[PDB]
Amino acid sequence: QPMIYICGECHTENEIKSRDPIRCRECGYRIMYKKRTKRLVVFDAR
Amino acid sequence: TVINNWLLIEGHTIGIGDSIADSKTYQDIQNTIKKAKQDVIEVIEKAHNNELEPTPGNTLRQTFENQVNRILNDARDKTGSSAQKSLSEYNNFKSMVVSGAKGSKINISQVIAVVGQQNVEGKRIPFGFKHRTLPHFIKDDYGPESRGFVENSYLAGLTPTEFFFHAMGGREGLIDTAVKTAETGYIQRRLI
Amino acid sequence: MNAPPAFESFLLFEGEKKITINKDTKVPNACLFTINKEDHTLGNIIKSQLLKDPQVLFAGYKVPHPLEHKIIIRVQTTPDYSPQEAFTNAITDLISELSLLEERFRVAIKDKQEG
Amino acid sequence: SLKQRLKGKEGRVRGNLMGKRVDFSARTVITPDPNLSIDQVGVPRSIA
Amino acid sequence: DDEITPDLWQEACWIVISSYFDEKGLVRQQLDSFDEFIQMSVQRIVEDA
Amino acid sequence: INGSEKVLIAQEKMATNTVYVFAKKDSKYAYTGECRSCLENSSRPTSTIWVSMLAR
Amino acid sequence: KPSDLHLQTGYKVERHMCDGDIVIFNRQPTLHKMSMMGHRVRILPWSTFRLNLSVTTPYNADFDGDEMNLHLPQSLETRAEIQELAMVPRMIVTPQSNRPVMGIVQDTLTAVRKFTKRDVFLERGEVMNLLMFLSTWDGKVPQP
Amino acid sequence: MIIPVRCFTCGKIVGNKWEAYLGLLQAEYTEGDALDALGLKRYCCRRMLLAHVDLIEKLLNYAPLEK
Amino acid sequence: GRICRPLLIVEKQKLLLKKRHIDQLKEREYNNYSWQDLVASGVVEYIDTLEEETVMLAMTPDDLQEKEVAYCSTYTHCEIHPSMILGVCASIIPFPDHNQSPRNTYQSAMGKQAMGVYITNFHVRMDTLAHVLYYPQKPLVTTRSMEYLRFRELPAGINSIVAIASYTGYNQEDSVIMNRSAVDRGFFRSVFYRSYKEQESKKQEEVFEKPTRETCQGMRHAIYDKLDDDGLIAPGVRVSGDDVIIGKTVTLPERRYTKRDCSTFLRTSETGIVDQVMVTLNQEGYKFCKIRVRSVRIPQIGDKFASRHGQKGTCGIQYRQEDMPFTCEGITPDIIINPHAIPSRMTIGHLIECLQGKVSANKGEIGDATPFNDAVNVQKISNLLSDYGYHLRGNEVLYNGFTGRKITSQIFIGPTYYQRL
Amino acid sequence: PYANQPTVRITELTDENVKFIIENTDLAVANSIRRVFIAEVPIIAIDWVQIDANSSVLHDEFIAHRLGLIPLTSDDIVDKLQYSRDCTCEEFCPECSVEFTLDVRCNEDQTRHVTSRDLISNSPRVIPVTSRNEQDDILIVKLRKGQELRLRAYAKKGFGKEHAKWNPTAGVAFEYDPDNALRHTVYPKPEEWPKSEYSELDEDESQAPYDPNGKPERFYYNVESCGSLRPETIVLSALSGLKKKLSDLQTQLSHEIQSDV
RNA sequence: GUGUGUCUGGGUGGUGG
Ligand SMILES: [Mg+2]
Ligand SMILES: [Zn+2]
Ligand SMILES: [Zn+2]
Ligand SMILES: [Zn+2]
């Protein structure tokens, strides 16, 4: 529910809700990145 | 199956040593090339000073070009004969060729002795510029080096003029393939 | 996509046998030993030790396909001497030779550290 | 138009009647395999 | 003395080529064509219109 | 252009304002002289003019 | 449900392609009769079709990224007619020039020339190793 | 983009040798002598440590996407 | 539209360029003596093709020497270097003058398909297709032309020890055998980046969301719980074919099915790990997302490989280290190529590259393969290699991997630059 | 009919490589011993990583692959460890695994090297090779300010037949008959072939006279370990492993003989 | 106490055999 994006410039965490304008909370950048998932990441060290 | 599993024991390679020849053979190749260039120079002098008599059934350019082609063909044949005669039974180029697996004696000659004459549309390199093949050549230069004769082998290394002329010959081959495919395709479709 | 698992060159599947004994029918005293999950490592030593045996008149190993992991060892012996016990003799002599070589290597490194 | 539908190589006769796309077919690159017989062909697991 | 010997020729010519590529680069034709179009050709079209 | 990196490929056109003479055979002219002529600094469409002589 | 999975005579089961299945193997451009041939399927791990090196000649096929089209005949009638008409052994000799379309090539050809030389002498163990790559061998080791 | 841990051919560890190689080069040792001093006698490992491009440094110039 | 190239100027059979220009150019970064100053000095000039008709061009300054008839004694211009007639891709080729010209053409085509770090900011870009090699290496045998093509800092292949031998017949018909153990150590491992894009719109209205079967019509039976609550896969999520990568639903004009599912799925044959997801706004203000999927591609059977001389080849079998042949020093090949690929294709540049690479690797040096360098030939490289304890022709006494019996014929083995297409 | 009497003569016993001579044995036995060196000597290497933070430019598979290739001191732990598939635990247990942890955060404005020192082991006997007490450490990744790397990785027993990371050797210099007496290799020009280091010949001679009755008898080794195991331990473990392979095959063969008769 | 809708039609360019 509290979806977190990452500003391209500020690298800040932003609680952006659904159907919201894509705006940074500091510099107002238009481009946002998602955080790495939480489920499980496992690789056999090949 | 049997022959491959024996090839595990025997083994079979190809390398730099198979594309080289002793000092005697390279001296013979260079002497043959030098004599060929001397003959071409003599024919050029005869044509310029008009000691050369045209043969019937063709013009003076055709006679001169035919004689130059004869001289250079003789040079290529003699250099290839010298290079092949210089091979050893352990030469891997010879092994690939006499087995008929791949390659040809012409490939052996080009690699070892002389790449030969580069041709465009069945004739020597045309005067793309004004009366010369490249800006590095004198106007009206009908000698071997000026008109596409690649003296060096693939081992020694092509000079840049020879590199360009060889590129022109290769381009001719590629264009011929590209148009031939479509033409034969339509012919085959009608035939079936 | 179709890459086989890496373990599969040495791990036996759920059920099959490590080695099978099959009689060859066109020649007597001839057998085909089908060892699964193996390669030239065992094949060459077993073949070489069998070649050392005077009571063996044929011994060879073959890997039918490098993408497969089985070897076929064919042994033909004198009529009294069965090839199965010839194979057993080869494995036993190889084990003895390897153990002797190991003990000699151990005493060799012992001496080298000692001087 | 209808004439354009019928006339072309990619049209209806040559494109759909004489030669057409078929089911139960596979395509992948080929690699050598001296162990197979001449009449044998290697096939990937996914394709089969 | 004010000449380049054959043994020094290779490093000299490669220095010259290195200088050229340091200055001009590799895509100078496209950049120069676009710069000429922007600086002059647009104004020439407007004035000529 | 809309996020796509576009590249303009140079077009190799025949040079303008220059008279060229070609041996246009398999026709009723023997020799022809072509001059693709365009005026400088406006680039009005090329008004090519051909001067040719009859074959006989 | 397993009540559905209960097979009875007359049903048709679309099993996957097992080994020994007959397939028609085609490479474009389909020039001559040998451009598409019947082949027997052998299952192999990796993602490429595999060919014996002899059939590279009738197909005009190389191994520098060549792709090939496999066709699986669906009916037993079609399978039988491919088996009786279009299999690789059945069409070694081509009618266009009444000579075999496929032959020994490259590595095998150079090595068989190097092999049949008069100076090649094989030790006993080497002979044992080579003799068992013969599928038609009678099992009797020849006199040296 | 970063020095491989193991040599592709033989398997000798060359992940620890990139920085020592750079230090030796900074010490005005010839790269052949530098490779010799690092114990890489087989030319596979010499190729390994000699043909490598330290592209991870260029990637580090860019900002992290999150801090 | 006129085409021209710089050329040196020759006057009175002497180069106008003197040692002073080179001395100044050596300090170019210091005193800002540029190529423009060299042009302004009257030392070089641009010669058009029409002007090239009437010039007398010298291949090289030693061609100006009047020790003989000298061919021509009115040279007007001189080439800076004959290797400059080659383009970008042809400059990558080492020893292009030792190859058949179609092979150089093929390598020019195939140099545009080789894998590598296509750009330094690749992690920022969201290109639809992208291939990045794990461990690119600058070629050991390097032509000086690609000192300025940025090739030694963005290389596109790996220097690999190849042995030109017929090992097991799996390298026949222009195919290669490669070391499986080397591949496990990262040899030619690469990563394939796939990017998807999607835009929501209102005219009906569609949004990014995680659809449910109780309010969306006609979806597929794929895990929609891979998505987040906003309808986007998070980075670090394994994803296969027919898996929704972006959850998108469109409303219908007029229950169980008030919406229609218009989600975008991953390509059916493709798999990977989602590694970068971006959300932004397009030109007209609607939501717009791009998702980059990362797929590690191990070199396997069938993957295409190519040398720098048109010697393309698909990977045949891969043998582990113990199965592969080895020298007396334990040096297995990284690749094995068939000898039959050489004689018909004339790729002698391949062999000379192997020889020069062996010499360079043993010497701790970077070999020069500028095409028209008289200072370098096969014999000098052979003498150099013989000084390092190897056979002068690059041949070695290889041993059979399966048996340890040293092969009768001595195999030609050495390092050469290889590319993964 | 019976086994040979293989003697051993060791010439070099450096801590990194061993150079030794085996006499009175077959070529197949020596080559199989070399193959077992390369591919059938179990060591312990990382084969399972769980990345819960990776802000580095290298992606997760890159870091995991680099981690797997780092050698670990496998001395005397491999003897008592078990294969992970052969172990009864549902997780990685100590009797079949070794846990490694890494958590490096670059809070500094200068570049951080995630060396092999950051691979913290749960056991003291097994550690990265460079950590043993001069020589530099293995670089996993470089980190600028703000980037982290948190991972928990497990090292399991395995041999080179499955993955190259489990290879304990780096270069196995196997050579026999340096003077070409057996003529197993034929030189077209024997004079221009450099002499081997074990050559018993003088400078005048190119190759030895051919001996028909001769067979491969003296084999020359140089096993260069990558540091995971001692080279002498590599040779001894190889011999024991090959012996146990033959023992398992003999047991299975006897079982089939019983099942058949 | 279940389950099918898979954006078509053109054009342009690049590429592989
Ligand atoms: Mg073709
Ligand atoms: Zn911001
Ligand atoms: Zn190495
Ligand atoms: Zn356990």
CA of I126 to C1' of K10 (A): 28
CA of I281 to C1' of K13 (A): 29
Per the structure, the residues numbered 99 to 118 in protein chain I that have their CB within 7 angstroms of any atom of strand K are 109-110, 113
Give the CA distances from residue I383 to residues B151, E43, I389, I392, in Å, rounded to whole numbers and listed in that order: 25, 65, 10, 6
What CATH topology corresponds to J43-164?
Answer: RNA Polymerase Alpha Subunit; Chain A, domain 2 (2.170.120)
DSSP state string for J226-261: -SSS-HHHHHHHHHHHHHHHHHHHHHHHHHHHHHH-
Chain D neighbours (≥3 Cβ pairs under 8 A) are B, C, G, I
Q: How far apart are CA J230 and CA C112, in angstroms?
A: 15
Burial of G18 (0-12, 13-18, 19+ CB in 10 A): exposed
Q: Is H25 annotated as a binding residue?
A: no
Find the domain containing A10 and state its range.
3-46
CATH code linked to domain C1-115: 3.30.1360.10
- How far apart are the CA of B176 and the centre of ligand 1, in A? 14
Three-state DSSP class for residue I284? coil
Q: What crossing angle do the helices spanning B60-85 and B23-49 adopt, rounded to 10°?
A: 170
Burial of B144 (0-12, 13-18, 19+ CB in 10 A): buried
G46, G138, G141: residue with CB nearest C3: G46
I174 is catalytic: yes
Q: Which two tokens stand for residue I346?
A: 């004339």
- DSSP assigned state of I128: S
Domain of residue A15, CATH code: 2.20.28.30
At the second CATH level, the architecture of J1-42+165-261 is: 2-Layer Sandwich (3.30)
Q: In Å, how far from its chain's centre is CA I124?
A: 21
Specify whether the CB–CB gap between I305 and I419 falls below 8 A: yes
| B1–D contact, CB cutoff 8 A | yes
Domain boundaries, chain C: 1-115
I334/H53 touch (CB, cutoff 8 Å), yes or no: no
Q: Which of C93, C94, C96, C84 is nearest to C41 (CA)?
A: C94
CA of C15 to C1' of K4 (A): 40
Enumerate long-range contacts of I214-220, CB under 8 Å, 24 or more apart.
I214/I256, I215/I256, I215/I257, I215/I258, I215/I259, I216/I249, I216/I257, I216/I259, I216/I260, I216/I261, I217/I252, I217/I256, I217/I257, I217/I259, I217/I260, I217/I261, I218/I257, I218/I260, I218/I261, I219/I261, I219/I263, I220/I244, I220/I265
Q: What is the 3-state secondary structure (H, E, C) of F18-37?
A: CEEEECCCCCCEEEEEEEEE
Q: Which of J60, G51, H1 is nearest to I301 (CA)?
A: G51
- DSSP assigned state of H6: B
Single-letter amino acid code for the residue at J78: V
Specify whether the CB–CB gap between J48 and J154 falls below 8 A: yes
Q: Which two tokens stand for residue G45?
A: 């791990």
CA gyration radius for chain B? 21
State the maximum Cα–Cα separation within chain G, in Å, rounded to a whole number.
Answer: 71
Separation in Å, CA of A30 to nearest CA in chain I: 6
Nucleic strand K near CB of residue G123 (< 7 Å) = no
Q: Give residue ranges of A with CB < 8 Å to any J CB.
A: 11, 36, 40-46
| E28–I contact, CB cutoff 8 A | no
Contacts of I386 (CB under 8 A, 6+ apart): I392, J192, J194
Peptide bond into G45 cis (omega under 30): no
Technique that determined the structure: cryo-EM
Specify whether the CB–CB gap between F31 and F16 falls below 8 A: no
Q: How far apart are CA B24 and CA B28, in angstroms?
A: 6
Q: Considering its fold, how many domains does chain A have in total?
A: 1
DSSP state string for G62-131: -SSS-EEEEE---SHHHHHHHHHHTBTGGGSEETTTTEES----HHHHHHHHHHSSTT----HHHHHHHH
Q: Which of J64, H58, A35 is nearest to I275 (CA)?
A: A35
Chains C, G: CB pairs < 8 Å: 44
Choose the catalytic residue: I37, I63, I97, I174: I174
Q: Which two tokens stand for residue D5?
A: 């539908």
| E47–I contact, CB cutoff 8 A | no
- How far apart are the CA of A5 and the centre of ligand 2, in A? 11
Phi, psi of A15 (to 5 degrees): -85, 90
Chain F neighbours (≥3 Cβ pairs under 8 A) are E, I
Domain boundaries, chain J: 1-42+165-261, 43-164
Q: How far apart are CA I300 and CA I315, in angstroms?
A: 7
Q: How far apart are CA C102 and CA J238, in angstroms?
A: 9
Instruction: Provide the residue count of chain G.
Output: 144
Chain H positions in Cβ-Cβ contact with residue J147 (cut-off 8 Å): 64
Nucleotides on chain K that have an atom closer than 7 A to a protein CB are 2, 4-7, 15-17
Enumerate long-range contacts of F40-47, CB under 8 Å, 24 or more apart.
F41/E44, F41/E48, F42/E44, F42/E45, F42/E48, F46/F16
What CATH topology corresponds to H1-67?
Answer: Arc Repressor Mutant, subunit A (1.10.10)
Residues just before a chain gap in chain J (C–N exceeding 2.5 Å) are: 133
Enumerate long-range contacts of D3-6, CB under 8 Å, 24 or more apart.
none
Q: Is H10 annotated as a binding residue?
A: yes
D32/I168 touch (CB, cutoff 8 Å), yes or no: no
Separation in Å, CA of J44 to nearest CA in chain C: 16
CA of I261 to C1' of K9 (A): 23
Q: How far apart are CA H2 and CA J66, in angstroms?
A: 10
H65/A6 touch (CB, cutoff 8 Å), yes or no: yes
Three-state DSSP class for residue I137? strand
Resolution (angstroms) equals 4.1
Q: In Å, how far from its chain's centre is CA H24?
A: 12
Q: How far apart are CA H22 and CA H38, in angstroms?
A: 11
Torsion over CA of I208, I212, I216 and I217, rounded to 10 degrees? 120
Specify whether the CB–CB gap between J67 and J140 falls below 8 A: yes
Smallest CA–CA distance from I167 into chain D, residue = D34
Q: How far apart are CA H43 and CA H10, in angstroms?
A: 10
Instruction: Provide the residue count of chain D.
Output: 48
E6, E15, E26: residue with CB nearest I25: E15
Specify whether the CB–CB gap between I134 and I155 falls below 8 A: no
Q: Which of J100, J101, J99, J107 is nearest to J148 (CA)?
A: J107
Separation in Å, CA of J159 to nearest CA in chain B: 27
Q: Which two tokens stand for residue J224?
A: 């260069």
| B122–I contact, CB cutoff 8 A | no
Nearest-nucleotide field for G62 (CA, C1') = K17
Specify whether the CB–CB gap between B71 and B52 falls below 8 A: no
Residue B151: count of CB within 10 angstroms of its CB: 21
| I113–C contact, CB cutoff 8 A | no
Q: Is J89 annotated as a binding residue?
A: yes
Helix (H) or strand (E) holding C76: strand C70-77
The residues whose Cβ lies within 5 A of ligand 3, an ion, are H 7, 9-10, 12, 42, 44-45
Bridge-based pairing state of the strands I216-217 and I259-261: parallel
Burial of I28 (0-12, 13-18, 19+ CB in 10 A): middle
Q: Which of J161, G131, I290 is nearest to C6 (CA)?
A: J161
